Design a protein around this ligand. Structure first.
Ligand SMILES: O=C(O)c1cccc2ccsc12
Length: 67
């Protein structure tokens, strides 16, 4: 029993709040991407979150930060 979809959108929703934090917004992209990876988001979920806050990032640029 996985509940794959619910845990995915919980991670993204928490990520959106994080990325909207007024202090977090003024930190570099690499710092935010590493933070979200440490909370269990995949690169694809990190990409979804950046689009949802209106600062879209490419999948490759996220993967390149994390590789
Ligand atoms: O899913 C990730 O977080 C991820 C991160 C970095 C590289 C690659 C390549 C395939 S997935 C992935």
């Amino acid at each position: 029993m996985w509940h794959t979809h619910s845990e995915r959108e919980k991670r993204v929703s928490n990520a959106v709040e994080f990325l909207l934090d007024s202090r977090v917004r003024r930190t570099p992209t690499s710092s935010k991407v590493h933070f979200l990876k440490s909370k269990g988001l995949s690169a694809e979920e990190i990409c979804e979150a950046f689009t949802k806050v209106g600062q879209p990032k490419t999948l490759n640029e996220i993967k390149r930060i994390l590789s």
